[PDB]
Each structure stands twice: as C-alpha cells, then as structure tokens.
C-alpha cells in the first residue's frame, strides 16, 4: 500500500463510463499489480475492461476472416496478400492482450488465492479458460492444439472447484458452465458434450430455484436463459 490504489479504481470507473476500455484495462492492470486481492467490484472492472478490449479485436478478426474467404475464391494476389496481412495485424494485437491478462491471472490473481477462496479461484480460472479460448479461435496447427489444451485445464479445474464448493444457481458457476459448453461446441467441435454440460448445469439450477432470494433470482435466470437458448439452437438439425 505505497501508491494510491483508490484513484486507480476510480480512473477505471471513469474510463468505463467513457467507453475507453484500453485506459480502463491499464488502470485495473495497475491495481492488480499492487498485489493485493480484488473486491467483487474490482474483479468485474478488470474482467470488463479486458473483455471489451479483446472483444473489439475478435469482432474485427471475424469480419476480416470472412472477407478473406470470399476474396480467395476470386484469385487476386494483391488483395489476398493485403487481407492476409491485415488479418495478421489484428491477430497479433488480440494475442498480445490475451497474454497481458493471462500473465496477470497466473502471476497475481490466481497465485494469491488462499485455498478457501473458491469463488475467486473459479472466476479467475474461468477467465483463464476464456482467454485461452480466444487464442484458439485464431490459432492453427500445433499452436492451436496447445492453447486448446490450456483452455481445457483451466475450465476443467474451475469446474471441479465450483461443483464442490459453490451452489448450482451461483451466477459464476452458471457462467462457467455456459462458457465451458461453448468451448466444447465451437473449439472442440463436440456437440454432445456441450449440450450435456449445458443441460446438466441448467437442470441442477432449476432444482434449487425454489428458494432463491429475489435479488439472486434475477442474476441466475439471466444466465440460465442463455444456457437454454444455446441448447435450443444446438438441438436443431
């Protein structure tokens, strides 16, 4: 506690409202680097900043990846090169953001979790799975295989921990199930696992839905919808 932490979180909050996620991420990275635990709010400000920063690049990457595929069919060298290069440019930005977060997760956030801070360990492991997943979206060959494995390990470990020490309605445990299911469908290409996981997690939540507070009831159903929407979409051919 030797530089002013509250100011940094306050800058993060400002930047968020100004939709300036690069600034936001840089503030929360600084907060993280002070090496103390993050509050629930602070966790989310980090999560949100980097999700938006990498998301802008995922969105770009997809638009360009798709242009590259109709373009290559027309066979223009100059244009095929140009598009390939620009896609690469975006890739390198995306990956650099991904390491940035992953490094914070490995070397600060996860590291400094005590054995019984199960909620935090799960949040951060899910996040680690997410960001390796985002690398997998744009990787190919041996590189892809490696980050896919890294994603699985993080999503899997978060699953074990969340199964035992968190209840099935908890937003984080649902969010994990949601993203892990999506990992299965989109990266592993394993629809039956995707669905089983989403279904299981949905059903387990419904069981406990009886005695949910009215506060947490809004939080859980929001995510449970998305599980269902996906399942509906996946079970349709």
């Amino acid at each position: 506690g030797l530089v002013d932490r509250e100011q940094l979180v306050q800058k993060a909050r400002l930047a968020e409202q100004a939709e300036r996620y690069d600034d936001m991420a840089a503030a929360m990275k600084n907060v993280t680097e002070l090496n103390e635990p993050l509050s629930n709010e602070e966790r989310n400000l980090l999560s949100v900043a980097y999700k938006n920063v990498v998301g802008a690049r995922r969105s770009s990457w997809r638009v360009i990846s798709s242009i590259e595929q109709k373009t290559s069919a027309d066979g223009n060298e100059k244009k095929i090169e140009m598009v390939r290069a620009y896609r690469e440019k975006i890739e390198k930005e995306l990956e650099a953001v991904c390491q940035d977060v992953l490094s914070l997760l490995d070397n600060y956030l996860i590291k400094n979790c005590s054995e019984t801070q199960y909620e935090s360990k799960v949040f951060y492991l899910k996040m680690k799975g997410d960001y390796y997943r985002y690398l997998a979206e744009v990787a190919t060959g041996e590189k892809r295989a490696t980050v896919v494995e890294s994603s699985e390990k993080a999503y899997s470990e978060a699953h074990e921990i969340s199964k035992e020490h968190m209840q099935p309605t908890h937003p984080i445990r649902l969010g994990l199930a949601l993203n892990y299911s999506v990992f299965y469908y989109e990266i592993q290409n394993a629809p039956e696992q995707a669905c089983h996981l989403a279904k299981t997690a949905f059903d387990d939540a419904i069981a406990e839905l009886d005695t949910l507070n009215e506060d947490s009831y809004k939080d859980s159903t929001l995510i449970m919808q998305l599980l269902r929407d996906n399942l509906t979409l996946w079970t349709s051919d």
């Binding site: 949601l178 469908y185 989109e186």
Partner: peptide, 7 residues
C-alpha cells in the same frame, strides 16, 4: 453460432 457471457 453460440453465445457466451454478457459483461
């Protein structure tokens, strides 16, 4: 295509 978190 599928959907992930809303944050």
């Amino acid at each position: 295509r599928a959907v992930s978190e809303l944050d």
